[model samples]
Target: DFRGYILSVQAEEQKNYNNSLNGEVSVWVYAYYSDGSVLVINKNSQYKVGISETFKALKNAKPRAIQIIFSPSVNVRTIKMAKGEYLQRSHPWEATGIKYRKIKRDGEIVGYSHYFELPHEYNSISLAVSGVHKNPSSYNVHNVMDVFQSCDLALRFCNRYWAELELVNHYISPNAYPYLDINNHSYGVAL
Candidate 1:
């Protein structure tokens, strides 16, 4: 019987020969016997492979005798955008063409508009918020709230709430994700 912990092998699949661009690739595990033979243990084919047995087999097998080959399959649906274009379209705030206009409250501008071109100083905070808002598949509202709380703490230490506001504005605008509808109306004075 194959008694081992199953290991999942993951890699990147490059469609073109350029090697610069590649998408995520993953493979399922299959059970194999001690004598380098594929095994079908039970009716449930899905859980056929075990990881511990696989490691034992590998240790016993001769290094030269073992062969591993990658069989890549191209995915046509995958879209590959230029780095420049992606930055502009996906993240307009990073682009020079896009601009932010400051809002005045009580005859005083809360933050300077276009203070820094790149805003590199607040990059980590910006990324934290963006990851929370944009990568919803990997993060939830609770996660975003935690990021916001952490950002607030950091802003208090640095006294740079303006930079944080700028990033939040950019993240909420229609340019980022239309479905989110993170407009000024929703943010209120918090921004």
Candidate 2:
């Protein structure tokens, strides 16, 4: 008996695609023998979207090659998003370089927002600004708790929690996902 190999299977049928194989698609896996012969190892006519695998075994046969066939379906593909080049902070107190998108309005570059992915317990976020200069001042200006919303705060006074940049333009920093919602413990915090 020949040793079995893992066969990974997945399907992609986005709703936006007009001809997406919404329900199920047929799949066929063939194993080639040393004598230039092929045998159907596995077949699934109702394969859908998911991570699946199967094991194949044969007696007195050394497989030369394996061929996968899909009917009424496109070739499987994948994409990566969370693996970003920017360093994300594990702790809220620590500061790290983050990737942010530039928000523009008309012809002028406006503010910036970072994809804020905090722990589940961290429902609220506090923005702290400390001056280690002649004045040596520290201030907690912006506080977002409960259900977070898009905020555009102008740093008119340093009393509030979120402060706007006076000299430099605002920016949204390092986001991996498009939108941050409440349940995901993530938000696109705008500055």
Candidate 3:
């Protein structure tokens, strides 16, 4: 027998699209297991529009990374209609003080980067904002024709109109850990 790990996949519907229409879309999530295997949690999963869903999978081992793919491609028209904006936020490392780097180009703020460490689970929590459209790709403008607005995964929209758009301040947390509980403890003695 081999020890394995469980992966929890969760998602919340974003009501940022058309308010009148409600629908469901199939989203596929892939994880690279530590043992050199690909684990698919939800292959034919259909998530309700504006409805949250959670799915779990048991892997032979822990996963190193994950990938969320929109097979049929997400509708980006409503996103454009909803006046969408995009941003990329990343934490490269942990630190005590405000360790950051700001990108500036053509006399315009391009993007912002930040680094920090938590003091504790409670006291170490930190929040950050990349700022409104610091870079062209991160523009906050609603005009799709604007040159800056074209900076985003523009190539993505060029051929595929229904493709997924870049995450817009989309908050997500992904992790893999050793879960020890009654359900997983099959060999445990129940007294």
TM-score of each: 0.15, 0.25, 0.23
lDDT of 3 by residue, 60-175 (tens): 34434433332222332211101011246534322311332332333422222222222222211122111111122223433545433333312211011111111111111111
Query: What residue runs in model 1 are displaced by over 4 Å at the alpha carbon?
Result: 1-98, 112-183, 186-191
Give the whole-model CA lDDT for all candidates, comma-separated.
Answer: 0.22, 0.26, 0.24
lDDT of 1 by residue, 90-157 (tens): 74322311232333443432221211222222211121001111121322233555444444332111
Off by over 4 Å in 2: 1-23, 45-59, 78-191
Which residue pairs of candidate 3 clash?
A: 95-116, 95-117, 110-134, 110-135
For candidate 3, the per-residue lDDT at 130 reads 13
In terms of lDDT, the poorest run of 10 residues in model 2 is 129-138
Give the distance in Å from residue 20's predicted Cα in candidate 1 to where it truly belongs: 45
Comparing candidate 1 with candidate 2, which one achieves the higher TM-score? 2
Clashing residue pair totals per candidate (backbone < 3 A): 9, 15, 4
User: Using alpha carbons, what is the TM-score of model 1?
Assistant: 0.15
Expressed as tens digits, the lDDT of each residue in 26-80 for candidate 2 is 3333334443344432222221211122323334434444333333232222100
Q: What is the C-alpha RMSD of each candidate to the true structure, in Å?
A: 28.0, 27.9, 21.2
Per-residue error for 24 in candidate 2, Å, reads 2.9
